[PDB]
Amino acid sequence: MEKQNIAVILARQNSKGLPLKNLRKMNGISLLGHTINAAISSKCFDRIIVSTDGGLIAEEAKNFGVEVVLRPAELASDTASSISGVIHALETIGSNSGTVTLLQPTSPLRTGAHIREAFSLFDEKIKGSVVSACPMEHHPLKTLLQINNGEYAPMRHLSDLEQPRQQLPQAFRPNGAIYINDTASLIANNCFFIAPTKLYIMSHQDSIDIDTELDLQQAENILNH
Amino acid sequence: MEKQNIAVILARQNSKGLPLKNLRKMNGISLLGHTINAAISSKCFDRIIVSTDGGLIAEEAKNFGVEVVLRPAELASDTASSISGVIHALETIGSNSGTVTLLQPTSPLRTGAHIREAFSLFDEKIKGSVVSACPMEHHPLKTLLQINNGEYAPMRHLSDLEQPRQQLPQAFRPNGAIYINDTASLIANNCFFIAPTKLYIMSHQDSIDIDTELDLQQAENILNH
Ligand SMILES: [Ca+2]
Ligand SMILES: [Ca+2]
Ligand SMILES: [Ca+2]
Ligand SMILES: [Ca+2]
Numbered sequence: 001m002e003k004q005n006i007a008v009i010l011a012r013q014n015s016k017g018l019p020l021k022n023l024r025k026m027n028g029i030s031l032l033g034h035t036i037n038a039a040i041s042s043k044c045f046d047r048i049i050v051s052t053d054g055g056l057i058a059e060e061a062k063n064f065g066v067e068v069v070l071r072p073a074e075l076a077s078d079t080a081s082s083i084s085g086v087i088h089a090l091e092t093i094g095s096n097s098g099t100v101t102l103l104q105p106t107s108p109l110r111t112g113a114h115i116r117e118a119f120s121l122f123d124e125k126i127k128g129s130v131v132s133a134c135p136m137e138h139h140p141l142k143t144l145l146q147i148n149n150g151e152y153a154p155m156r157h158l159s160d161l162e163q164p165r166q167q168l169p170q171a172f173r174p175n176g177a178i179y180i181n182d183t184a185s186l187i188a189n190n191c192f193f194i195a196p197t198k199l200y201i202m203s204h205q206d207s208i209d210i211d212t213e214l215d216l217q218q219a220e221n222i223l224n225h
Numbered sequence: 226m227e228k229q230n231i232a233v234i235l236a237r238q239n240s241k242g243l244p245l246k247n248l249r250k251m252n253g254i255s256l257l258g259h260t261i262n263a264a265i266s267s268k269c270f271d272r273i274i275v276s277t278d279g280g281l282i283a284e285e286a287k288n289f290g291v292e293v294v295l296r297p298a299e300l301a302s303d304t305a306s307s308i309s310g311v312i313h314a315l316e317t318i319g320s321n322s323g324t325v326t327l328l329q330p331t332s333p334l335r336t337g338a339h340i341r342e343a344f345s346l347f348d349e350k351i352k353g354s355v356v357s358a359c360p361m362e363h364h365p366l367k368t369l370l371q372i373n374n375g376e377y378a379p380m381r382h383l384s385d386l387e388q389p390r391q392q393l394p395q396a397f398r399p400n401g402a403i404y405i406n407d408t409a410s411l412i413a414n415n416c417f418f419i420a421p422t423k424l425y426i427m428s429h430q431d432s433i434d435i436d437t438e439l440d441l442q443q444a445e446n447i448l449n450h
Contacts, residue, residue, distance in 0.1 A: 133369065138398050140365030140380055144358065144424060146395040152424050155365055155380070161399060161418045170371040173363050174386060193386045199369060199377050 003098035006183065007045040009035055009061075010085045011105050012076040013054025017211050022057055022105050024210075026220050031210060032057060034108040036064040041112030044119045045101070051089045052076075067093070083190055090183065100183045102192060107177035108219055109206045118178045118200035127185050128196040132178035134207040136171045172199055175207035228323035231408065232270040234260055234286075235310045236330050237301040238279025242436050247282055247330050249435075251445050256435060257282060259333040261289040266337030269344045270326070276314045277301075292318070308415055315408065325408045327417060332402035333444055334431045343403045343425035352410050353421040357403035359432040361396045397424055400432035 011022040011032055018024070022032045029037070032050070039048045050061035051069040053076035058068045069089045074080065086102060099122065101115070110132065122130045141160040144152040154160060160168060178200060179192040186194065208219050236247040236257055243249070247257045254262070257275070264273045275286035276294040278301035283293045294314045299305065311327060324347065326340070335357065347355045366385040369377040379385060385393060403425060404417040411419065433444050 136363065136365075136368060138361065138363075140361075140368040140370075143361060143365040143396050143398045144422070145365075146397075150423075152397065152422070154422075155396075158418050158420055158422065159416075161422075162416055171368050171380075172371075172377065173368045191384075191387055193383050195383055197369070197377070197379075197383065197386075198375075 001095075001097050004046040004095050004183075005044055005098055006090065006093070006095055006100045007039045007048045007103055008086045008089045008100060009039065009048070009050045009103050009105060010082055011050055011052045011054075011057050011061075012071070013052065013057060014076070014078075016078055018213065021210060023060060024216060026108055026216060027223050030060055031105040031108050032060050033064055035103050035105045035110075036061065036066055038110060038112045038115055039066070039103055040064075042115035042119070043112070044115055046098075047093060047095070049089050049093060051085050069093070083186075083192065087187060087190070090187070096183055096187060098183050100181055100186055102179040104176055106210045107175065107207070108210060109208055109222060110177035110202070111206075114200070114202060114206065115178060118180060121198045121200055122180050123198070126196065127182035127194070128198060129192060129194045130178070130180040130198045130200055131174045131193065132176075132202050132207075133172040133199040134175045134202050134204050136173055137204075139165050139168055140171050141168050172201065175202060176209055177202065177207060226320075226322050229271040229320050229408075230269055230323055231315065231318070231320055231325045232264045232273045232328055233311045233314045233325060234264065234273070234275045234328050234330060235307055236275055236277045236279075236282050236286075237296070238277065238282060239301070239303075241303055243438065246435060247279075248285060249441060251333055251441060252448050255285055256330040256333050257285050258289055260328050260330045260335075261286065261291055263335060263337045263340055264291070264328055265289075267340035267344070268337070269340055271323075272318060272320070274314050274318060276310050294318070308411075308417065312412060312415070315412070321408055321412060323408050325406055325411055327404040329401055331435045332400065332432070333435060334433055334447060335402035335427070336431075339425070339427060339431065340403060343405060346423045346425055347405050348423070351421065352407035352419070353423060354417060354419045355403070355405040355423045355425055356399045356418065357401075357427050357432075358397040358424040359400045359427050359429050361398055362429075364390050364393055365396050366393050397426065400427060401434055402427065402432060
């Protein structure tokens with residue numbers, strides 16, 4: 001088996017929030033279609049799979065010219081992990097070697113250029129994850145964590161809470177748009193974060209995650225320059 | 226000198242962002258007035274001081290029936306620390322014993338009831354800070370910090386990045402609305418965070434910080450039930 005670069009787009013019919021989110025249109029193209037177009041235009045992938053339990057989602061994926069894996073109910077439930085869906089898609093097409101990239105349709109401003117830029121960071125020898133990330137609005141060192149009921153401790157030092165942000169290490173959070181992994185490592189570890197993890201930095205604007213009707217319009221407003 | 230409970234409201238004329246922010250009206254009352262009303266209605270304070278360099282701000286403070294400390298230019302500049310303003314106000318009225326609470330006008334949804342609730346957490350024997358805080362939208366353990374150029378490390382463990390949030394310690398960030406300190410300790414430490422710090426938890430809604438015109442309207446929308 002030669003190595004393959006696989007993109008997996010997980011899109012279930014009964015999304016846990018906004019109804020029918022994956023097929024909602026933005027600029028005349030479904031969220032699903034925006035992410036398929038990003039995958040195709042990246043030219044990074046040998047195979048692009050949409051994994052779904054819904055008939056309308058499957059028909060949309062076929063109309064965009066990509067492969068469909070049908071997920072049974074037990075893998076498309078509110079308790080089913082994303083990793084189990086990706087593993088199932090890989091098993092269905094018979095790939096256990098190469099790279100596998102998770103592209104969630106809820107990140108419609110992540111483009112094919114972003115995907116190519118992220119892919120350029122992947123190290124084929126060391127094989128840690130590449131994860132897209134954006135800067136933290138609120139610095140995570142300026143927080144306290146609960147240790148006992150009503151008792152809290154600084155994330156690191158109490159003095160960090162008053163430090164000028166520019167004097168603190170730069171901080172980033174995964175934004176959900178892109179997770180790139182070595183396929184065999186993802187199968188063995190059964191997770192998306194595999195050390196040593198590299199970050200592909202994206203802007204706040206491009207990192208928008210669609211959960212609400214207002215996220216949809218904001219994303220549309222951004223697309224208009 | 227008997228102990229006094231002092232509230233200090235820092236309000237300079239040349240705020241670093243929105244122009245004339247401290248006197249902008251919300252529901253027919255200036256931001257400054259909302260915070261003065263919170264201080265008065267809390268009944269927590271022996272003295273309420275507005276520290277300012279601006280004539281219009283001073284006149285507003287006098288119209289609400291509180292004391293005014295005039296800050297010279299060197300203490301009302303873009304580089305002047307908040308702590309130096311509070312220290313100057315305390316020196317001006319001659320208080321070095323009791324408690325001192327910083328109330329920023331940019332937190333107009335923080336009420337007198339919030340202040341009283343926060344004050345009830347202050348420990349007069351141990352004398353750590355009480356700081357108002359709100360829950361973190363994005364969990365601070367699900368972040369990576371820059372260590373070298375293009376190299377990042379998990380805040381704590383890489384496995385935290387995939388942990389269900391409810392399995393992680395609860396996390397909070399100071400929201401800027403209330404800082405309560407022992408006066409002598411604040412003078413000695415020259416900072417607002419003094420161990421052991423206790424948190425007064427506020428909702429996201431009540432924690433709104435005014436920096437933009439849209440923050441102003443959102444805060445007004447919230448005031449309407
Ligand atoms: Ca091809
Ligand atoms: Ca520590
Ligand atoms: Ca009185
Ligand atoms: Ca660590």
